[PDB]
Design a protein around this ligand. Structure first.
Ligand SMILES: *[C@@H]1O[C@H](CO)[C@@H](O)[C@H](O)[C@H]1NC(C)=O
Ligand SMILES: *[C@@H]1O[C@H](CO)[C@@H](O)[C@H](O)[C@H]1NC(C)=O
Ligand SMILES: *[C@@H]1O[C@H](CO)[C@@H](O)[C@H](O)[C@H]1NC(C)=O
Ligand SMILES: *[C@@H]1O[C@H](CO)[C@@H](O)[C@H](O)[C@H]1NC(C)=O
Ligand SMILES: *[C@@H]1O[C@H](CO)[C@@H](O)[C@H](O)[C@H]1NC(C)=O
Ligand SMILES: *[C@@H]1O[C@H](CO)[C@@H](O)[C@H](O)[C@H]1NC(C)=O
Lengths: 128, 115, 294, 148, 99, 50
């Protein structure tokens, strides 16, 4: 009977034996949950023309947000962008006159949401 | 949820005796058939024995004249007396409540006999 | 096996100025046209770094001996080397530098790098006996006389040479930063051709990270490994070594400082400000800007 | 008038994970597929480090008789990361395979290779009936029965 | 293991107590009541399940769990185990193993 | 313009503060701690951010 005893050391020391790391295909130009080299987040990915230095693995905003990243498998650079969001104001006359309303989606296009695109956002239900 | 309670096993030296018990509770439609099955690690479910409501007892050739089944009509329970135990009887045993539709299956009690 | 050399005789220390050198990239984040403040272990600006000749001829007779003292390692070390003939080959790190405690050894031969952590029995004067072949002379064969024995090895690393081939005033500056944090030994490095500057040149060159190694031992002291081109059995009167140790190495000690690093549009740290140097730098750090108005 | 009632927010539907593509692997093949195994009184401990250990190959391979583990579940080894792994492979008898687990006694458990009650690790065995046995009897594996 | 917010085979795979649990956990030793000389194995415990339990969730499923990649189809074997193991309640057991 | 930009720049930077919590990242607290002790660390972030 051939026997192997694998004794594993779990100490307060850095690890040298590591398990396999799962991977998935890179979905681009879509709102997705992403995990790049342990960095977890939610957003869409786009192709970027930036040229990160080889050691650099992440991109940072004027504040602390990460804008760009390097894909581990394919060395192409991908820049991140927040999944769209905004307020939904309801444009209504007095209910004693009419119950008809128009909905304004602040600071968004008319694709993510009688449609009138304005600088304030995408207006739906109101005639131009 | 018809439930079957099996108890009374464990470790016993060669030549000893034990008494396992199955209590069938819930629906257990009256014309039921309660049986006992054997499984040792690496083998299939071996039909140990069977009893119907007719009071007839059916036993396999493996344990000829050694194991017995007793019925309790008041609680509709069953007890197998397993005597003259041999290491070849080392297997987990299970109940088969045939009932009248949804055949029920056991949870298990370990039976070990060795020296 | 090791070879016994002469007594070092405790040469008096000599210092020199480090004009804004030793700045490395603290993170792996691409930053473009932005001023980032990082508090980390840095070499202070305009600091005294101790400089040693690889070979020093100080005796009246003209004796040539390696100046390879065992130097302390307090929270990181900036090692700069101005050389032209690849006479410096690597280092050894540890606390006792003997078989009692684990030690790290880095060497660079003509082909690759050898990095080990074992229980080396280092001799007093480790080195590499380094000799050309009779017909080619393109490469130089090395004989390692660093440690008497090695036991309990727990790591092994081989990669492309840390030190490029230097094979006549084309001196080169190799600047390295070694840190030992949380059981990780981090090497940052940069290589720059130099011209007609004996000491450390004035300018700014950021140190790209080279490698992060999970040795996980305690380091307190370190030594420099040198290449012996001459013969220890028969020392020549002169010129047997390399031009009386024209090449040299400078050692500086990192301390916890807050630095303001300016990343340009193409991702490189082009300037840094040490907040504790002068009040002007303090004002720059408090305003986060490299320029201050009246 | 105008009133801000809710907050529109595009939500994500799928998740993507990208890690450095796996490359380095541990030498389990040199341990489990080794041609020769040492006697039970010169045990082979091989140190495993600086490599990626894929344990699904072993646990789902089903080419080993035992997969017992203590202190760690066998299905979470691919998630855990260890400082070092010590691989001890020996040829033993089957009735004595029950003696390789912590807290046990016997000629092997008391005289050959003592396992402290506080193990973390896995005992994995096979049966080399078509590898280690010969027609005339293989007496190259030695066993003590007596010690002080 | 019987308290809000705890883990363990009983805490995750058995009785699931919620965080906001206005109530009292009460227990006493049953050595002279529950144990027998030959061992009382009438009390059964699962060590394996597919997932942790919801609060106050009660599972009486007896399905054999699949530890490997192959299906068990209600039959034990290689990497197939019944859910419930029995307990060695004996009057000579130590306080940790006593009922 | 400068004062309004500073007010928002300060507001965003406060997201990186721990306020006593284990991590300024909520996902690094939930997936490093059981909810019963993960709510103690998260309750320090809501108070700080609010
Ligand atoms: C990852 O795998 C791809 C496909 O084989 C290969 O082109 C790429 O170089 C790999 N990257 C590394 C070195 O991890
Ligand atoms: C508004 O609607 C109310 C009904 O509640 C009505 O009594 C009132 O006269 C209306 N006023 C106007 C100006 O239309
Ligand atoms: C987004 O809005 C702009 C108007 O500013 C428009 O030109 C563009 O086509 C919109 N995007 C899409 C995908 O329609
Ligand atoms: C405004 O008039 C122009 C013609 O001059 C027409 O093309 C356009 O559609 C009109 N817009 C609206 C909102 O009626
Ligand atoms: C640097 O060394 C010089 C002498 O060479 C000395 O006067 C000066 O005080 C030193 N500076 C520091 C910061 O130690
Ligand atoms: C931008 O990168 C190029 C090399 O691709 C370099 O010539 C240029 O100097 C860089 N920009 C700056 C400000 O240095």
């Amino acid at each position: 009977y051939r026997v192997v005893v694998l004794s594993f050391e779990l100490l307060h020391a850095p690890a040298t034996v590591c398990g396999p790391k799962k991977s998935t295909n890179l979905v681009k130009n879509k709102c997705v949950n992403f995990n790049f080299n342990g960095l977890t987040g939610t957003g869409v990915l786009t192709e970027s023309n930036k040229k990160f230095l080889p050691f650099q693995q992440f991109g940072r905003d004027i504040a602390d947000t990460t804008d760009a990243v390097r894909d581990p498998q394919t060395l192409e650079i991908l820049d991140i962008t927040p999944c769209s969001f905004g307020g939904v104001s309801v444009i209504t006359p007095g209910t004693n006159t009419s119950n008809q309303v128009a909905v304004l989606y602040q600071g968004v296009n008319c694709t993510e949401v009688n449609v009138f695109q304005t600088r304030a956002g995408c207006l739906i239900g109101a005639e131009h | 949820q018809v439930q079957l309670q099996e108890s009374g096993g464990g470790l016993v030296q060669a030549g000893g005796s034990l008494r396992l018990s199955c209590a069938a509770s819930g629906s257990i439609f009256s014309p039921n058939t309660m049986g006992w099955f054997r499984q040792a690690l690496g083998k299939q479910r071996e039909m140990v024995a069977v009893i119907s409501s007719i009071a007839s007892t059916q036993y396999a050739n493996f344990v000829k004249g050694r194991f017995t089944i007793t019925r309790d009509n008041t609680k509709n329970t069953v007890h197998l007396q397993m005597n003259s135990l041999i290491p070849e009887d080392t297997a987990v045993y299970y109940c088969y409540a045939v009932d009248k539709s949804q055949d029920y299956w056991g949870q298990g009690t370990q039976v070990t006999v060795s020296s | 096996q090791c070879v016994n050399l002469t007594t070092r005789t405790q040469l008096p220390p000599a210092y020199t100025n480090s004009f804004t050198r030793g700045v490395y990239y603290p993170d792996k984040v691409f930053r473009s046209s932005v001023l980032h403040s990082t508090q980390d272990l840095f070499l202070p600006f305009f600091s005294n770094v101790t400089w040693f000749h690889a070979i020093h001829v100080s005796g009246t007779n003209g004796t040539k001996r390696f100046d390879n003292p065992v130097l302390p390692f307090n929270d990181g070390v900036y090692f700069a080397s101005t050389e032209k003939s690849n006479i410096i080959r690597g280092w050894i790190f540890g606390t006792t530098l003997d078989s009692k405690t684990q030690s790290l050894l880095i060497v660079n031969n003509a082909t690759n790098v050898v990095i080990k952590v074992c229980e080396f029995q280092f001799c007093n004067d480790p080195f590499l006996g380094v000799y050309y072949h009779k017909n080619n002379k393109s490469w130089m064969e090395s004989e390692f006389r660093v440690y008497s024995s090695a036991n309990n090895c727990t790591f092994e690393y081989v990669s492309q040479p840390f030190l490029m081939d230097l094979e006549g005033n084309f001196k080169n500056l190799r600047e390295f930063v070694f840190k030992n944090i949380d059981g990780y030994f981090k090497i940052y490095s940069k290589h720059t051709p130099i011209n007609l500057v004996r000491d450390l040149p004035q300018g700014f060159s950021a140190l790209e990270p080279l490698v992060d190694l999970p040795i996980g031992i305690n380091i307190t002291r370190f030594q420099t490994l040198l290449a012996l081109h001459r013969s220890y059995l028969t020392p020549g009167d002169s010129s047997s070594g390399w031009t009386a140790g024209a090449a040299a190495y400078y050692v500086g000690y990192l301390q916890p400082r807050t630095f303001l690093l300016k990343y340009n549009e193409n991702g490189t740290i082009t300037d840094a400000v040490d907040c504790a140097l002068d009040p002007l730098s303090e004002t720059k750090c408090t305003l986060k800007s490299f320029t201050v108005e009246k | 008038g105008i009133y801000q009632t809710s907050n529109f927010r595009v939500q994500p539907t799928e998740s993507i994970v990208r890690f450095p593509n796996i490359t380095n692997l541990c030498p389990f093949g040199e341990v489990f597929n080794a041609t020769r195994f040492a006697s039970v009184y010169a045990w082979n401990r091989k140190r495993i480090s600086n490599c990626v250990a894929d344990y699904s190959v072993l646990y789902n391979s089903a080419s080993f008789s035992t997969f017992k583990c203590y202190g760690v579940s066998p299905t979470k080894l691919n998630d855990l990361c260890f400082t070092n792994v010590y691989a001890d492979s020996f040829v033993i008898r089957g009735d004595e395979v029950r003696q390789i687990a912590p807290g046990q006694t016997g000629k092997i458990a008391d005289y050959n290779y003592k396992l402290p009650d506080d193990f973390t690790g896995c005992v994995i065995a096979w049966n080399s009936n078509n590898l280690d046995s010969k027609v005339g009897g293989n007496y190259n594996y030695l066993y003590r029965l007596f010690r002080k | 293991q019987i308290a809000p917010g705890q883990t363990g085979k009983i805490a995750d795979y058995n009785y699931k107590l919620p965080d906001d649990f206005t109530g009292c956990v009460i227990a006493w030793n049953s050595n002279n009541l529950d144990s027998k000389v030959g061992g009382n194995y009438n009390y059964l415990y699962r060590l394996f399940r597919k997932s942790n339990l919801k609060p106050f969730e009660r599972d009486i499923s007896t399905e054999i769990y699949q530890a490997g990649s192959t299906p068990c189809n209600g039959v034990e074997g290689f990497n197939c185990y019944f859910p419930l193991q029995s307990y060695g309640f004996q009057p000579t057991n130590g306080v940790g193993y006593q009922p | 313009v400068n004062q309004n930009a500073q007010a928002l720049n300060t507001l965003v930077k406060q997201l990186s503060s721990n306020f006593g919590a284990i991590s300024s990242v909520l996902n690094d607290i939930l997936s490093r701690l059981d909810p019963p002790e993960a709510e103690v660390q998260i309750d320090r972030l809501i108070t700080g951010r609010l």
